[PDB]
Amino acid sequence: ENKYSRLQISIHWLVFLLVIAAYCAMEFRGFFPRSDRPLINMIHVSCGISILVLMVVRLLLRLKYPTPPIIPKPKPMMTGLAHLGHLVIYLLFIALPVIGLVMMYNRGNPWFAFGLTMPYASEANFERVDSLKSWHETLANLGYFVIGLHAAAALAHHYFWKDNTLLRMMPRKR
Ligand code: HEM
Numbered sequence: 001e002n003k004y005s006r007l008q009i010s011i012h013w014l015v016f017l018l019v020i021a022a023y024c025a026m027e028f029r030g031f032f033p034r035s036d037r038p039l040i041n042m043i044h045v046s047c048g049i050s051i052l053v054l055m056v057v058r059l060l061l062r063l064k065y066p067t068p069p070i071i072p073k074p075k076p077m078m079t080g081l082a083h084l085g086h087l088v089i090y091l092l093f094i095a096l097p098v099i100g101l102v103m104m105y106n107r108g109n110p111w112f113a114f115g116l117t118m119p120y121a122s123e124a125n126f127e128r129v130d131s132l133k134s135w136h137e138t139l140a141n142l143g144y145f146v147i148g149l150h151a152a153a154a155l156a157h158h159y160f161w162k163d164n165t166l167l168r169m170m171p172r173k174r
Pocket residue numbers: 019022023026027044045047048049051093096097098099100101103104133136137140141143
């Protein structure tokens with residue numbers, strides 16, 4: 001009816017938590033000794049892979065289900081634009097972890113996700129890694145900005161315009 005489905009709400013906020021954890025693992029890496037870095041890297045990649053899976057799943061749900069309407073109703077072009085913004089989020093947060101994965105693959109070393117050993121190239125590819133590393137960094141930085149705009153828009157809706165944009169994405173009926 002008037003909310004996203006409970007599964008979509010769960011996934012939205014789960015991904016938020018996982019993204020926070022992914023960023024935090026990288027941002028605070030140097031606060032841990034060298035000896036803990038493998039674990040920090042594992043947390044990072046494991047969150048990243050979880051996020052990728054959930055980004056794909058949420059997108060398939062987005063196709064399957066209607067978008068709940070906003071009350072009052074935006075102009076059709078405003079909805080189009082918000083929906084375009086969403087497409088940009090879907091793309092960014094799929095491309096970011098994919099680049100991560102391809103980076104780890106092309107490094108040609110054993111690596112671990114969810115306590116499990118993952119595939120890697122039998123020979124390393126250094127031109128590719130350098131480029132992938134640069135892209136991962138840029139997209140991760142673009143991610144901050146995009147989440148910030150995204151959250152800010154939600155807050156402008158909820159507090160300034162006083163519409164139900166954010167309530168539709170919140171778990172409780174309020
Ligand atoms: C939404 C998902 C993810 C986010 C937000 C994210 C974010 C970041 C950030 C902020 C950094 C530090 C970049 C910098 O130096 O400023 C980073 C580094 C890294 N990420 Fe991710 N990441 C994600 C997914 C992944 C995945 C899935 C993998 C691997 C499977 C991965 C592997 C790495 C690696 C190896 C580095 C270290 C680069 C280096 O030290 O040479 N990331 N990530």
